[PDB]
Amino acid sequence: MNLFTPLSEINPTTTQELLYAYTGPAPVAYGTRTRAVLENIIRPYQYFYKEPNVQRALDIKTGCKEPEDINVEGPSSGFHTASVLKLADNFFRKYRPAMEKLKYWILVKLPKLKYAELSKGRQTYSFIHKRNLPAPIALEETVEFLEQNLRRKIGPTLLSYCQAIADVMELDETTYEYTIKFSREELWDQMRTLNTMWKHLERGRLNRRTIATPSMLIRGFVKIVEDAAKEILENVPTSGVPEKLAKLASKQTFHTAVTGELSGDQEKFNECLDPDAMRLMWTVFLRKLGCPDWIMELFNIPFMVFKSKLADMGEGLVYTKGKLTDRKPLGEMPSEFDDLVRNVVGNSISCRLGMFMGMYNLTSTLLALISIEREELTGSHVESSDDFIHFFNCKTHEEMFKQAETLRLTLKLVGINMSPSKCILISPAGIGEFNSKFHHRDFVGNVATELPALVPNGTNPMTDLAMGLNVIKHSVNTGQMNLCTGALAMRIFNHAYKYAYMALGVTRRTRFMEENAITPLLTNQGASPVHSFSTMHLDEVALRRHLGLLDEETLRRILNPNNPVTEDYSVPSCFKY
Amino acid sequence: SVGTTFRTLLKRDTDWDVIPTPRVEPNVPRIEGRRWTQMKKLPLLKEKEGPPSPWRALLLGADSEYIVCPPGTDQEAISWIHSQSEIECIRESKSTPASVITCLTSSLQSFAEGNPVRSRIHEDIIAFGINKKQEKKQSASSSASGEWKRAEYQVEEMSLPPWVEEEMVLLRSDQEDNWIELEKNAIYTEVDGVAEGLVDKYIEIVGRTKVASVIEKWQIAATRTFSQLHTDRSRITACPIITRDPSGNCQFWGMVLLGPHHVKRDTDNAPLLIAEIMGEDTEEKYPKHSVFSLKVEEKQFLLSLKITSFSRNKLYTFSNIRRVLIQPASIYSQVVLSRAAENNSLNLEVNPEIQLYLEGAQRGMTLYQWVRMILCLEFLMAIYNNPQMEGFLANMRRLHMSRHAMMERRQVFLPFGSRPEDKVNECIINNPIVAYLAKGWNSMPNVYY
Amino acid sequence: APQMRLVYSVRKPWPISMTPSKEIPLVFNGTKLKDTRTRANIVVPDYWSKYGSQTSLEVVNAILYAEDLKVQRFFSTEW
RNA sequence: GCAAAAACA
């Protein structure tokens, strides 16, 4: 570790990029996710009260609590209704143009949104086939079910889909087409069911995490509320989505004042939030801006569905007799999760208060943003998921103490519970950290979580090369990489590109060029590279005829539209197989 | 719109109604909170105690050597090695029985006859775990006793190995060859030429080192093993590890044998039998390896055989191990630009003295040797990437930031129940390099004036 | 992660699913090209690159359009 | 034997 800490000619901030486990196998989760899902469900019930009483918190249908019951020495799950009201009003006081623009959204082109683009979603779980299926076929199955049960065609607008769902769920007995029947209780159970799955390619912590995905019949509501979150977050300076860190650190405070920086993370950011506070926030803002009652229902239904979640418990806990191993579901044999046994509903489990990954990453940010808005909190705050940075400008240290203490209390009011061991406060400002960006003095260092692949994507040579070049250009533009690193990365990418397409060594393709007297002319064919460091956005066939390395006859041969095989700025060619 | 049963159906699991209209007056309550605290002594990373953690990786690392063979193809070199050598066992391990050498000699011969894939033999049975799942399941069923209880898995805590510093200093051995061959790109402008010159100078300041040869060997081995994974087989495949020095000769690092590897998903473990050339043997460092004596042209070598099994993800990741060269160069590049920022006159032959804490003493050292240090440690971290590594490293970034802040004379504040040392400690169990970094951080001074 | 399969896909027998064509021979100089949609070998695009049908120069210029303008702005500027 | 939360073999 001492090797990573310089003292002369360079500061540790720049070399802190070395504090990353690059070029290594990312952890992959094995076996059952039941223990992780059960722990995720049980954490919020263990922090509602100062004294841990899981059973007493199982009957709580609303995270409303009292300030005396909030735990200041540990995680606290729940919220205070009056606190949420006042903080929402305070946030409503400021950021008027963003609210006016979301009013424009709701009154102009929110109904213009369709449901076909919902096909661009993540993997779904079909409630007819009981299997994980891709989004497009799930959408087609859903629209077929809707049209065969509602006795009318579903309109292209997403609001037509919303009304279609609302009407079809009131038809009691339903059937798909086989001839898979359903009931009202079955439809409600499908609404309540959440599909948990191991998070793949996750780096940054020892313990793996489970992300949830919802049914396709609620994804419309969740995506419209997330969209509203997007167009309220894009036009607020205190959000974490844009260069906000640099422009905020560009502050030049006067000498007779003290400025300090807090960089913090969150403990159990998805195990201390109740959706009811989110409901109250959305309802208060929409009512005070002027939305009607049908908009109230439209923007409050997703939390209605989420408050009754039935996230699957994986495949069951692990039990060993001797050297044997078996997956026994919860409740079959006593375990450390006995308190939740009464909440088991078939293969699922009821969890009134809680949160899961992959559901709401921006409206939780909105809750944090309304929480930070107070009167004595005269600082600048940037939030993104479970990471935050705050800048305090004041005159004396105890003012910093009280401001930071009341900030922590306000975040705990709605159930954020910033990490005591991951929040670092430096009373003189200048060196901060947020997301993946560091900041020393005035310079800011962007660090990529993942290095560039430096490998063709596998579609076809020219498109893969274009994507690799664009990735290198994006990496170098953001400051994550520089001249030497960019050139080394493009050399490595060139080597991988040549090897993957049998452009190196002796092989069948090389023998094909050799016997047929076909000299190489392109990079994939085996010719010398033509792309330089400054040539990141230039086409493969370009810069070759301009330099005279390609004759127009072979260009006509390859660029002929009548060829049996035919942002990506790749010209069509015969090699685009 | 709202339905009839819709309304109550939504009611059942919420105290409030669908559209919430609370009657409480909006206000901010005042809550007594704990005291902001400030720290003097930097946290001391606790050191796990117990047996030293042995070496575990795809290949050997610093103990990787090669046999010099006359110029020719892979088959000629394999035939020369097989026909001009005899094998006798020196060290026997229960994890890798001696009989698996019969497998290796079965492949060295077979590959010498134009058959990279050969039929199965009896010694292959206990070489790749063939029918091992059925064996274990039937044995457990026959010996099952007691009553079902919770799994309660645990990981043993193991101390810092004594061989970490020898690894860290042996990867830096000077080599007569560059060991890096990257095709030069074209140059059209001055900045592109400067970048190419920087990458060059990087190549011949970190190329003639043992770590570069080890990275090349890892890349070749992983690439050859991965190239034979997709094709589902039931017969043993041979993937020799031979490189070419810039004199025409052949360099035999070792040979990996791939079993039946009936892979289904993307994370299944294909079995492997890896034979490699060693420079020296150590008991507690390679407890699961079998060591044989190798005689080639009255020349002594040690052959290490290990039975292992790795997933396609890990093999593919190590097939692109060369990317590890990116991280150190950046520093060097930045340092060069730093000198440019000093005078706006780039040199390309700058070797500034970097000051570091070595054995508890603040002393300077050359930039090139420091870059070699960085490349070796990055390679060691990359080949030992486990969730403990990533968790410890991510939680240690904060302590590194705090230490830098104290170096540049600023105060750091912590909450009441703030113990970052625990959130850095829980990831320190048995990883050798994690413990090495913990010891290095602890050796540095903890109080700064 | 499709990039993990390209290594097989390039080495896969008959990598390319060919649109049925006639000007491409079945076997050229002791080497199968197509699988008589039908499949084709990796050497077929290279065969087309030298012994394939050409087209009008205006068509080539139109196809290469929107990709040159960057080239003659990069090679006509002074650093 | 490989991993790391029972997976592959």
Swiss-Prot record, chain A:
Reactions listed under catalytic activity: RNA(n) + a ribonucleoside 5'-triphosphate = RNA(n+1) + diphosphate
Q: Please list the GO terms describing molecular function.
A: nucleotide binding; RNA binding; RNA-directed RNA polymerase activity
- Keyword vocabulary terms for this entry: Nucleotide-binding, Nucleotidyltransferase, RNA-directed RNA polymerase, Transferase, Viral RNA replication
What's one Pfam family here? Answer: Flu_PB1
Domain (RdRp catalytic): residue spans on this chain: 249-424
EC top class named in words: transferase
Its Gene Ontology biological processes?
Answer: viral RNA genome replication
User: What Enzyme Commission number(s) appear in the record?
Assistant: 2.7.7.48
Report the function annotation for this chain.
RNA-dependent RNA polymerase which is responsible for replication and transcription of virus RNA segments. The transcription of viral mRNAs occurs by a unique mechanism called cap-snatching. 5' methylated caps of cellular mRNAs are cleaved after 10-13 nucleotides by PA. In turn, these short capped RNAs are used as primers by PB1 for transcription of viral mRNAs. During virus replication, PB1 initiates RNA synthesis and copy vRNA into complementary RNA (cRNA) which in turn serves as a template for the production of more vRNAs.
Family assignment from sequence similarity: Belongs to the influenza viruses polymerase PB1 family.
What is said about its interaction partners and assembly?
RNA polymerase is composed of three subunits: PA, PB1 and PB2.
Indicate what this protein is called per its UniProt record. Answer: RNA-directed RNA polymerase catalytic subunit
Source lineage: Viruses, Riboviria, Orthornavirae, Negarnaviricota, Polyploviricotina
Swiss-Prot record, chain B:
Alphabetic keyword roster: Host nucleus, Virion
Q: Where in the cell is it found?
A: Virion; Host nucleus
Cellular component (GO) terms are: host cell nucleus; virion component
**GO MF:** RNA binding
Q: Does the keyword Hydrolase apply?
A: no
A biological process (GO) annotation for this entry?
Answer: viral RNA genome replication
Function per UniProt: subunit of the RNA-dependent RNA polymerase which is responsible for replication and transcription of virus RNA segments. The transcription of viral mRNAs occurs by a unique mechanism called cap-snatching. 5' methylated caps of cellular mRNAs are cleaved after 10-13 nucleotides by PA. In turn, these short capped RNAs are used as primers by PB1 for transcription of viral mRNAs. During virus replication, PB1 initiates RNA synthesis and copy vRNA into complementary RNA (cRNA) which in turn serves as a template for the production of more vRNAs.
Q: What does the subunit section of this Swiss-Prot or TrEMBL entry state?
A: RNA polymerase is composed of three subunits: PA, PB1 and PB2.
Question: What does the similarity note say?
Answer: Belongs to the influenza viruses PA family.
What protein name does the entry list?
Polymerase acidic protein
Species assigned in the record? Thogoto virus (isolate SiAr 126) (Tho)
Ranked from the top, the taxonomy reads: Viruses, Riboviria, Orthornavirae, Negarnaviricota, Polyploviricotina
Which residues of the complete protein does this chain represent?
A: 174 to 622 of 622
Swiss-Prot record, chain C:
Covered residues, full protein = 52 to 138 of 769
Q: What does this protein do?
A: subunit of the RNA-dependent RNA polymerase which is responsible for replication and transcription of virus RNA segments. The transcription of viral mRNAs occurs by a unique mechanism called cap-snatching. 5' methylated caps of cellular mRNAs are cleaved after 10-13 nucleotides by PA. In turn, these short capped RNAs are used as primers by PB1 for transcription of viral mRNAs. During virus replication, PB1 initiates RNA synthesis and copy vRNA into complementary RNA (cRNA) which in turn serves as a template for the production of more vRNAs.
| Name the record gives this protein | Polymerase basic protein 2
Where does the protein end up?
Answer: Virion; Host nucleus
Q: Subunit arrangement?
A: RNA polymerase is composed of three subunits: PA, PB1 and PB2.
Note the superkingdom of the native organism: Viruses
Similarity comment: Belongs to the influenza viruses PB2 family.
Q: Which organism is it from?
A: Thogoto virus (isolate SiAr 126)
